[PDB]
Amino acid sequence: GYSDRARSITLGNSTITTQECANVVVGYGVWPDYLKDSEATAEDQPTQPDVATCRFYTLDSVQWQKTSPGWWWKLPDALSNLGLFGQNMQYHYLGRTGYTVHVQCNASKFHQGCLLVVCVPEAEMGCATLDNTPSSAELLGGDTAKEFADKPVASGSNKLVQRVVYNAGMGVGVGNLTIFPHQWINLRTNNSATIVMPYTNSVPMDNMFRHNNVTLMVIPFVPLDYCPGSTTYVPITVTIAPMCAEYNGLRLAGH
Amino acid sequence: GYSDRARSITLGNSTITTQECANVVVGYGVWPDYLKDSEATAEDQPTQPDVATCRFYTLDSVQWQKTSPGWWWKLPDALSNLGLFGQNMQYHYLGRTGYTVHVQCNASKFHQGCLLVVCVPEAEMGCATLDNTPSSAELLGGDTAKEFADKPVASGSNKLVQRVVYNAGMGVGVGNLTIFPHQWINLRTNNSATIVMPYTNSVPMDNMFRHNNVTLMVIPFVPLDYCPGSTTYVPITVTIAPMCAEYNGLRLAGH
Amino acid sequence: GYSDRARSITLGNSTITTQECANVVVGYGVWPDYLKDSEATAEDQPTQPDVATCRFYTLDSVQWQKTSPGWWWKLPDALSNLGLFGQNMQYHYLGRTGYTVHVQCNASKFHQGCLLVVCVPEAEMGCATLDNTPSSAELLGGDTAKEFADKPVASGSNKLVQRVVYNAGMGVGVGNLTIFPHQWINLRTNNSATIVMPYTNSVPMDNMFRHNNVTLMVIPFVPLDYCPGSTTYVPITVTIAPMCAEYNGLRLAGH
Amino acid sequence: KVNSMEAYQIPVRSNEGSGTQVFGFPLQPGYSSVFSRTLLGEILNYYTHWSGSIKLTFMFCGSAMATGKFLLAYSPPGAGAPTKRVDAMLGTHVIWDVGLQSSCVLCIPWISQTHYRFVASDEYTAGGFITCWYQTNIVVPADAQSSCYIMCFVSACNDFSVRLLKDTPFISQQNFFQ
Amino acid sequence: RVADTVGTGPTNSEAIPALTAAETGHTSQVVPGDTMQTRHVKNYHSRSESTIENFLCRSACVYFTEYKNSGAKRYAEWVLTPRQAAQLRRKLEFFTYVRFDLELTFVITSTQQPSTTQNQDAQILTHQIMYVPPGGPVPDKVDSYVWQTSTNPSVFWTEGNAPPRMSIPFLSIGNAYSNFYDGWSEFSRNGVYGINTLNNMGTLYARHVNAGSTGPIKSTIRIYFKPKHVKAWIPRPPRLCQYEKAKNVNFQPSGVTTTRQSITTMTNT
Amino acid sequence: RVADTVGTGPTNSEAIPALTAAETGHTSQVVPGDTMQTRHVKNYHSRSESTIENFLCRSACVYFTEYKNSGAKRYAEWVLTPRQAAQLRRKLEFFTYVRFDLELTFVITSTQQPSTTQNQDAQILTHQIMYVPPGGPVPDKVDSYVWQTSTNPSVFWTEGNAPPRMSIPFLSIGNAYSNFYDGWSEFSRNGVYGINTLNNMGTLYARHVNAGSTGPIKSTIRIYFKPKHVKAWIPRPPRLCQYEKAKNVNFQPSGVTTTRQSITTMTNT
Amino acid sequence: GAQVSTQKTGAIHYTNINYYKDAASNSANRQDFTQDPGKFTEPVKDIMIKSLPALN
Amino acid sequence: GAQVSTQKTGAIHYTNINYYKDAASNSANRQDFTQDPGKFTEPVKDIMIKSLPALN
Ligand SMILES: O=C(O)c1ccc(NS(=O)(=O)c2ccc(N3C(=O)c4ccccc4C3=O)cc2)cc1
Ligand SMILES: O=C(O)c1ccc(NS(=O)(=O)c2ccc(N3C(=O)c4ccccc4C3=O)cc2)cc1
Known part of the structure; x- marks a missing residue:
């Protein structure tokens, strides 16, 4: 209907409308749907959270500086605090999810900059120490944005993650991250990215409080830039919504 | 399809796309096509240059000042250097051509100005001396823009062309030049002019290295104007493409 | 029609008639035609030079002495000066050609002599120095006839071609050159050779200003001989015509 | 500019004289040090042959009021790369007019004398030169930054095929990973 | 086509x-x-010649070890992983999930070791390559009951014949081998990182059946893997920076490209 | 008939x-x-028995090199060209353009080298012949990562068996191999003359897998080419004067025929 | 039964009979030609048609 | 299928079955008999008939 600048994604109670943007990028060509019986490995009865764990959970906003390295938020561990998603993953052994990762950032028409919004499934990060693994408090968020750096993280005995924008903390060239579903938030025109992740794993259902199946990375390829004066604080706000959640094996609260 | 801001003219190898502009102005109502046998005066066999002498030959750019007189480029003598058009006119006695004269000039939305893009067939210029004819090195370009002046060219024994914007160097009021196919490049909105010239002459085919059948004139009617600062160098770039070229009488290289 | 002494080859503007000669020798059994789509490796649009690059370009005449070694003219590099063939090969990356190599030599009926007119595709010449390659100014003509010699070219550090009539400058016996399409110009009767070369290469189209696909060699097997007096200057004139020319990839002027 | 995010951005600025060169690199993927670590080039280093067209999408990431036109030209090998826009025109070019749809695809067609080409350097076959020139200088109003950026993207066409597999040179090891 | x-x-x-x-x-x-x-x-x-399978189905050497026929290490041991050779590893790490069967070929070549032993004459060494499934018994001394191959597969190969070959089917707890695992094995998120039990096809031990020559002989078992019936899902960037560890993705930062001169240069340095 | x-x-x-x-x-x-x-x-x-194929389809030895199993040159290297043997070369140079598949058979024969080393006993040397496609990696030290044969074909052959055989298809950038190229590779017409990239099927390296005997052993890899599925176009004179270089048609002038006595003699000298 | 299929030709027939009990011991499926780039390329919800601009 | 063809006799039958995936690994085409000397011999435009002289 008319212009494609408009979009409106209603999931449950919360709606995200955007005045101006572009197309929604759908997964690898699959939209998250429930797991059928010919893939169901669980023998127990699953719950149906429906609309009450499919609302757009608005994670922490982070401020984009004129020159800023980039950010990443793990996916089952950014929602391990918010709402009933954070409950269910803890009371249930197995969980299965899809996402609507919607990154929204506005800017004036005198500002320029360009974010790459990718969603890397299975981002296994390296480490500054070449024989130690990361910690679980540097590697993961807490719904907070972890940010990289533009200089190598110095080696020692530290278990801090290796964080360099250009290697993406994985040891792959940053410019090749575009294979994975993504979109760009070029501030010239297009002010949001919508990436619909379908459930991707080697097993049909997996624990979410020990395994992080998706990692969102928002990397500015063209630094934010403008003239003197104006506004100097253009945040990037992430709204993520679980989609087609399904759990099994009703244990008890844990870690 | 959708907005008319878009246009795309593909002739051979080079394409000119423009994000924003208006309609293409087609000749006097005729689009250049090959000369049929009921008009063919030549008794010899013509060549077909096809795509290799139908690409958009990008002539010299000229810089539009805040106040600038105007410019003109003769048509068979702006292409007498570039590519195979410059070859063919010299090896062949007779030639027949149409054109796609596309004048492109961009500006910001804080700039104003307005060019008149006309194509005067048979522009016979006067002379500063009222009893001498022009020279062939002042009158013609070399693919370079010749520019007029806003004050009368002083008389003497000089053979320099009479150049005054308001008389167009022909002794006709400048405001009446709009009869001829044209377009305006109002910088407010509309950033190119496309004028499709069909072959116009009294004879069916004529030598091109002695006769100039069309003369493009780009005259700013509203001077370029803006506020202090910003950018101060808005060029005007001309891309011309021969269309339906046909030659005859394969002589040898000459003048 | 009547006698076979007559022949008349009209290509474009120039015609070559001959009062007396013999049959035209057609290639290997193929007459040059345009390359079809099932052989077209180029993805670009080719030009059609037609009649304006299919005229008989008359190369340099050379004088046959009483005892003379022989001559050779490379084929894409004897026409790299004359007409529009010399232009097109330089503005276009790829080119494809056939030829009508017509060698004409007249003599009186009191003269005797016999030329072998062969066209060796891919004549890769040796060198006087047994570890150096030829130069590009001794090996090639300039539309001029290069002539061999009857004594071995002395070795040193020179890059001059090995030129001996009896080895043909290739290291093959001269008497076996007859496999290739040819004809003889026996001065007793038969005063021209017409050899129609079709395009022969391993690839469908190739650059012509770096590769010479054919080499015409005119070798006198029976020296010119006569009595004292009479005329003493019987030239051999070569008229070559491109046939079914086709180019692609409209670059710019080069070497 | 090969150890930061400065590598990927192509600096564009308003320069008063038009005919200045924006960038220029040969097309010779899997050898050229511009495409040696791209996605297309890295798949290409496992093959000895390649054939097909290649798409170079240029995306203007300037201000939203900045304008400019660029003459993106690909000149086949036949000479040693243009040094003027007036020479670059003669090739296969595409004039990109900016203003909405912030990308324009210059598609490089297959021009080769053979049905394949080497990925590794050779001089029997070459891939020509890809250059960009200003067609009409970057006009930027007041309060908008006068230095913009362009991004270059490399992709393969649907008329693309690779043949004869070999193994990469851009990976190495000394002793086994303990 | x-x-x-x-x-x-x-x-x-x-x-x-x-x-x-x-x-x-x-x-x-x-x-x-x-x-x-x-x-x-x-x-x-x-x-x-660009299909997913044909790409991956090429035999690559993953490893090789040495074992004296008379001394200390009379057997070699290897935990099966393709993560010991850079070449094969980088091809697999071009996909997040892969599923395949393996063809294990072993190219065993013997070399005599310098010694002052008198009258060294070999009587055709026979080698035993034994596959021990994950959670099997582990041999120590080379004469242990473990080498009886009661249920454990083994190839017995006499030297000077076509190299031994055997197939392994797809053996994974899951439905694909994960080439990248983000997660721990422990619920408290400590310990090993991405050392998940899906790409751990037990151990492979090899030894000399006979006592060979009187003198010492050292043999070199070279292991070859060849992926048949491959299906690969989720493409991903090829590795840039060099590998550092055989179970981690650890790396030292390095260049984004190979450098050249200016932005308009037409020749690589 | x-x-x-x-x-x-x-x-x-x-x-x-x-x-x-x-x-x-x-x-x-x-x-x-x-x-x-x-x-x-x-x-x-x-x-x-005079058909184009049957004529050319005969295995001809194109080359042979030697490589010590313990010393310096532990590997041999050869840029594939039929231009190293006069016999095969002259047959190919009877046609301007030829198209064919190759059958490479390698006849590796080992010879013990004289030495004062004590108790020299071989344990059946295994040879590796490896094909490196044009623009591949180049091994240096014989232990280089290059020899992992990650994608590069290789035949592993234990000595004392039927000689290794492998096929190569028609691999040419063009549509025929040019046996004579008149032209340069450079647009300025300098450098190499007729060293065109159409008959350059990379390199072939070979080495000893094992350490053989205690003493030195030198092995001799002999390469055989056999043209299958031949199609040959444009006939041309056979070479007269002897070959001088393996990439040029350089020659020293020599006789046009073998001499005899008079024009009417009935017996060759 | 004997599965007969054309050899991979550029521009014929080979018998092949599986001889082993398992189907994990059959020769590789080198011939298995399929292409479907509507996945990673153009993953968008509503396909952009090549005749107008993607955005309004 | 099995291709049966006569052995090259002077003045019978052999089964041959291609066993390899590629068609560049099949045995040579030793039998492939054709002759057509209207090429290199007599390449002339208008064929000279043997009953009169070629020239007038
Ligand atoms: O290879 C295995 O299957 C095999 C090898 C060792 C093995 N371990 S054991 O149960 O400790 C064992 C250890 C030694 C012997 N053993 C001897 O001590 C002996 C002395 C003289 C002749 C024969 C043998 C002989 O077998 C038998 C069994 C089991 C099986
Ligand atoms: O053949 C190849 O595939 C192969 C041979 C050499 C090679 N190059 S390397 O990456 O420099 C390398 C160099 C040496 C070793 N290496 C050792 O240093 C060693 C010591 C003791 C036992 C085994 C080994 C062993 O493999 C492993 C790899 C790669 C592969």
Whole structure:
């Protein structure tokens, strides 16, 4: 209907409308749907959270500086605090999810900059120490944005993650991250990215409080830039919504 | 399809796309096509240059000042250097051509100005001396823009062309030049002019290295104007493409 | 029609008639035609030079002495000066050609002599120095006839071609050159050779200003001989015509 | 500019004289040090042959009021790369007019004398030169930054095929990973 | 079989198949015809030697160890992983999930070791390569009951014949081998990182059956893997920076490209 | 199957199938019947063992190199060209363009080298012949990562068995291999002359897998080429003067024929 | 039964009979030609048609 | 399928079955008999008929 600048994604109670943007990028060509019986490995009865764990959970906003390295938020561990998603993953052994990762950032028409919004499934990060693994408090968020750096993280005995924008903390060239579903938030025109992740794993259902199946990375390829004066604080706000959640094996609260 | 801001003219190898502009102005109502046998005066066999002498030959750019007189480029003598058009006119006695004269000039939305893009067939210029004819090195370009002046060219024994914007160097009021196919490049909105010239002459085919059948004139009617600062160098770039070229009488290289 | 002494080859503007000669020798059994789509490796649009690059370009005449070694003219590099063939090969990356190599030599009926007119595709010449390659100014003509010699070219550090009539400058016996399409110009009767070369290469189209696909060699097997007096200057004139020319990839002027 | 995010951005600025060169690199993927670590080039280093067209999408990431036109030209090998826009025109070019749809695809067609080409350097076959020139200088109003950026993207066409597999040179090891 | 070009000609309508935002995460398909005009060209090129399987199905050496026939280490041991050779590893790490069968070929070559032993004469050493499934028994001394191969597969190969070959089917707890695992094995998120039990096909031990010659002989078992019946899902960037560990993705930062001169240079340094 | 003769008889009409100018570049076909009279003779002779393929399809040795198993050159290297042996080369150079598949057979034979080393006993050397496609990696030290044969083909051959054989298909950038190239690779017409990239199937390296005996052993890899599925176009003169270089047609002038006595002598000198 | 299929030709027939009990011991499926780039390329919800601009 | 063809006799039958995936690994085409000397011999435009002289 008319212009494609408009979009409106209603999931449950919360709606995200955007005045101006572009197309929604759908997964690898699959939209998250429930797991059928010919893939169901669980023998127990699953719950149906429906609309009450499919609302757009608005994670922490982070401020984009004129020159800023980039950010990443793990996916089952950014929602391990918010709402009933954070409950269910803890009371249930197995969980299965899809996402609507919607990154929204506005800017004036005198500002320029360009974010790459990718969603890397299975981002296994390296480490500054070449024989130690990361910690679980540097590697993961807490719904907070972890940010990289533009200089190598110095080696020692530290278990801090290796964080360099250009290697993406994985040891792959940053410019090749575009294979994975993504979109760009070029501030010239297009002010949001919508990436619909379908459930991707080697097993049909997996624990979410020990395994992080998706990692969102928002990397500015063209630094934010403008003239003197104006506004100097253009945040990037992430709204993520679980989609087609399904759990099994009703244990008890844990870690 | 959708907005008319878009246009795309593909002739051979080079394409000119423009994000924003208006309609293409087609000749006097005729689009250049090959000369049929009921008009063919030549008794010899013509060549077909096809795509290799139908690409958009990008002539010299000229810089539009805040106040600038105007410019003109003769048509068979702006292409007498570039590519195979410059070859063919010299090896062949007779030639027949149409054109796609596309004048492109961009500006910001804080700039104003307005060019008149006309194509005067048979522009016979006067002379500063009222009893001498022009020279062939002042009158013609070399693919370079010749520019007029806003004050009368002083008389003497000089053979320099009479150049005054308001008389167009022909002794006709400048405001009446709009009869001829044209377009305006109002910088407010509309950033190119496309004028499709069909072959116009009294004879069916004529030598091109002695006769100039069309003369493009780009005259700013509203001077370029803006506020202090910003950018101060808005060029005007001309891309011309021969269309339906046909030659005859394969002589040898000459003048 | 009547006698076979007559022949008349009209290509474009120039015609070559001959009062007396013999049959035209057609290639290997193929007459040059345009390359079809099932052989077209180029993805670009080719030009059609037609009649304006299919005229008989008359190369340099050379004088046959009483005892003379022989001559050779490379084929894409004897026409790299004359007409529009010399232009097109330089503005276009790829080119494809056939030829009508017509060698004409007249003599009186009191003269005797016999030329072998062969066209060796891919004549890769040796060198006087047994570890150096030829130069590009001794090996090639300039539309001029290069002539061999009857004594071995002395070795040193020179890059001059090995030129001996009896080895043909290739290291093959001269008497076996007859496999290739040819004809003889026996001065007793038969005063021209017409050899129609079709395009022969391993690839469908190739650059012509770096590769010479054919080499015409005119070798006198029976020296010119006569009595004292009479005329003493019987030239051999070569008229070559491109046939079914086709180019692609409209670059710019080069070497 | 090969150890930061400065590598990927192509600096564009308003320069008063038009005919200045924006960038220029040969097309010779899997050898050229511009495409040696791209996605297309890295798949290409496992093959000895390649054939097909290649798409170079240029995306203007300037201000939203900045304008400019660029003459993106690909000149086949036949000479040693243009040094003027007036020479670059003669090739296969595409004039990109900016203003909405912030990308324009210059598609490089297959021009080769053979049905394949080497990925590794050779001089029997070459891939020509890809250059960009200003067609009409970057006009930027007041309060908008006068230095913009362009991004270059490399992709393969649907008329693309690779043949004869070999193994990469851009990976190495000394002793086994303990 | 690839696609074909078709005749086009001039274009002056509002189509502009070139101009289109690539900001939408959509990689547009543009043919020659769109930026110029190209006649009908038939292509017979074949995009076969580029299939996922054919790419991965090439035997690559993953490892090799040495074992004296008379001394200390009379047996070698290897936990099966393709993560010991850079070459094979980088190909597998071009996909997130892969599923395949393996063909294990062992190229055992013996070399005599310098010694002052008198009258050294070999009587054709016979080698035993034994596969021990994950959670099997572990031999120590080379005479242990473990080597009885009660249920454990083994190839017995007499030297000077075609190298031993055996197949292994797809053995994974899950439904694909994970080449990248983000997660721990422990619920408290400590310990090993991405050392998940899905790509751990037990151990492979090898030893000399006989006592060979009187003198010492050292043999070198070279292991070859060849992926048959491959299916690969989720493509991902090839590794850039060099590998550091055989179970981690640890790396030292390095260049983004190979450097050259200016932005307009036409020749690589 | 060749043609047959048929009865003729006297001829007194204006036919003269003999007299005809050969100045027209036309090689006339004259039968026995034209110069005499010959009755009907049936010929069952067969012109098969003269076909283009059968002519060229014979295995010819193109080269052989040597490599010590313990010392310096532990590997040999060869840029594939048929231009190293006079015999095969002259057959190929009877055609301007040829197209074919290759069968590479390697006949590796080992010879013990004299030494004062004590108790030299071999344990069946295994050889590796590896094909490196053009623009591959190049091994240096014989232990380099290159020899992992990650994608590069290799034949592993234990000594004392049928010699290794492998096929190569037609690999050429063009549509035929050029046996004679007139042109340069450089647009300025300098450098190499006729060293075109169409007959350059990379390199082939070979080495000892094992450490063989305690003493030195030198092995000799002999390479055999056998053209299958041959198609040959444009015939041309066979080479007269002897070859001088493996990439040029350089020669020293020599005789046009072998000499004899007079023009009317009936016996060769 | 004997599965007969054309050899991979550029521009014929080979018998092949599986001889082993398992189907994990059959020769590789080198021939298995399929292409479907509507996945990673153009993953968008509503396909952009090449005749107008993607955005309004 | 099995291709049966006569052995090259002077004046019978052999089964041959291609066993390899590629068609560049099949045995040579030793039998492939054709002759057509209207090429290099007599390449002239208008064929000279043997009953009169070529020239007038
Ligand atoms: O290879 C295995 O299957 C095999 C090898 C060792 C093994 N471990 S054991 O149960 O400790 C064992 C250890 C030694 C012997 N053993 C001897 O001590 C002996 C002395 C003299 C002759 C024969 C043998 C002989 O077998 C038998 C069994 C089991 C099986
Ligand atoms: O053949 C190849 O595939 C192979 C040979 C050498 C090679 N190059 S390397 O990456 O420099 C390398 C160099 C040496 C070793 N290596 C050792 O240093 C060693 C010591 C003791 C036992 C085994 C080994 C062993 O493999 C492993 C790899 C790669 C592969």
